[PDB]
Amino acid sequence: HKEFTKFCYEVYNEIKISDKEFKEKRAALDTLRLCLKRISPDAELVAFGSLESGLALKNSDMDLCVLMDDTIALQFYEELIAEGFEGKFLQRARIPIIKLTSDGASFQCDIGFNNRLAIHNTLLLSSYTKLDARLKPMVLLVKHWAKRKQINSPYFGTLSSYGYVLMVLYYLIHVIKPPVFPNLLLSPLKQEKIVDGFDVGFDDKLEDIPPSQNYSSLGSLLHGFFRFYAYKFEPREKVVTFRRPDGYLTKQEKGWTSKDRYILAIEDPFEISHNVGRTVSSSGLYRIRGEFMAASRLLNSRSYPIPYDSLFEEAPI
Numbered sequence: 639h640k641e642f643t644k645f646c647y648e649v650y651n652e653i654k655i656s657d658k659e660f661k662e663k664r665a666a667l668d669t670l671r672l673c674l675k676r677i678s679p680d681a682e683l684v685a686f687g688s689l690e691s692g693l694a695l696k697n698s699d700m701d702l703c704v705l706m707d708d709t710i711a712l713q714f715y716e717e718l719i720a721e722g723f724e725g726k727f728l729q730r731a732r733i734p735i736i737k738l739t740s741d742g743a744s745f746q747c748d749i750g751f752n753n754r755l756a757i758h759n760t761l762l763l764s765s766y767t768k769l770d771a772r773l774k775p776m777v778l779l780v781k782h783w784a785k786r787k788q789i790n791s792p793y794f795g796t797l798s799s800y801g802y803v804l805m806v807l808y809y810l811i812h813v814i815k816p817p818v819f820p821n822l823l824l825s826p827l828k829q830e831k832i833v834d835g836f837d838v839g840f841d842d843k844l845e846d847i848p849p850s851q852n853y854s855s856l857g858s859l860l861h862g863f864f865r866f867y868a869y870k871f872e873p874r875e876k877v878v879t880f881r882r883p884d885g886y887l888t889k890q891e892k893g894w895t896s897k898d899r900y901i902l903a904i905e906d907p908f909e910i911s912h913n914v915g916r917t918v919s920s921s922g923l924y925r926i927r928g929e930f931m932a933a934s935r936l937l938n939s940r941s942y943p944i945p946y947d948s949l950f951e952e953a954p955i
């Protein structure tokens with residue numbers, strides 16, 4: 639897997655966020671943080687998602703959250719419009735969202751209100767990123783593949799990027815032997831921490847966690863990932879889980895047999911009642927499995943040189 643790993647790192651270095659782009663987004667956060675602090679001094683504007691965990695590709699969108707504990711949401715929107723930012727305010731029932739698009743760098747940022755669970759799972763992925771240097775390039779390459787193969791559209795019957803990140807994590811914890819990572823949620827050193835009615839606790843003392851016993855290359859880890867979800871993983875029977883010591887959970891045990899969509903079952907590490915794969919339709923899953931099989935077929939090809947570039951060739955929309 640020497641040559642494929644060489645290719646993997648070549649692509650990784652092209653698709654990852656630049657330090658310039660990251661500093662630009664951090665500068666943007668500080669400006670937005672000032673507009674909030676001038677309307678509500680007790681409120682805090684926190685970043686979450688790819689950018690915060692360091693699993694972001696270049697030209698990435700921002701995911702921000704305003705921590706409170708009530709008309710502050712509309713007031714903050716009005717302050718941002720006054721400051722010079724362009725965007726819209728949207729509220730469905732009691733959940734407001736600010737969606738910005740201008741100002742002085744290129745903008746495409748989303749602001750949520752009290753998405754505490756999201757900040758916490760972003761902490762979990764941040765910890766794993768700090769545990770092994772192979773996770774960041776592996777996650778970026780999977781996200782680049784899913785985007786290019788048109789299987790990263792939740793509103794079109796396929797899966798979210800967060801979904802793919804959990805698919806990678808589950809493989810690296812509970813499938814690959816030796817494991818790349820331990821399950822931090824099930825550590826004896828883990829302590830319960832209830833946030834919005836869910837346990838967000840895990841072992842965060844990474845300094846005491848022994849190093850990985852898995853010494854495989856990035857190229858090898860990726861080949862295994864594709865091979866696992868293409869031929870071994872059966873979505874009609876099993877649930878992707880972070881709550882079982884062996885990673886073994888049937889849909890029967892979970893009660894996810896018949897949000898009511900359980901075509902592909904990815905149980906969130908903290909919000910265990912929420913199936914991260916609820917967006918995946920039957921036809922969407924058919925396309926996902928097809929692309930996984932295609933990736934596997936390519937990687938074990940006996941025709942040299944292997945056209946590795948085809949792994950990221952854009953599929954018809």
Ligand SMILES: O=c1ccn([C@@H]2O[C@H](COP(=O)(O)OP(=O)(O)OP(=O)(O)O)[C@@H](O)[C@H]2O)c(=O)[nH]1
Pocket residue numbers: 686687688689693694695698699701755756757759760781798799800801914
């Ligand atoms: O089902 C979900 C989806 C997303 N989230 C929360 O929103 C964030 C992911 O939002 P995204 O689904 O957009 O994935 P991503 O940002 O990590 O990668 P890109 O957009 O760059 O393609 C994650 O960090 C997670 O915390 C959930 O909590 N549950």
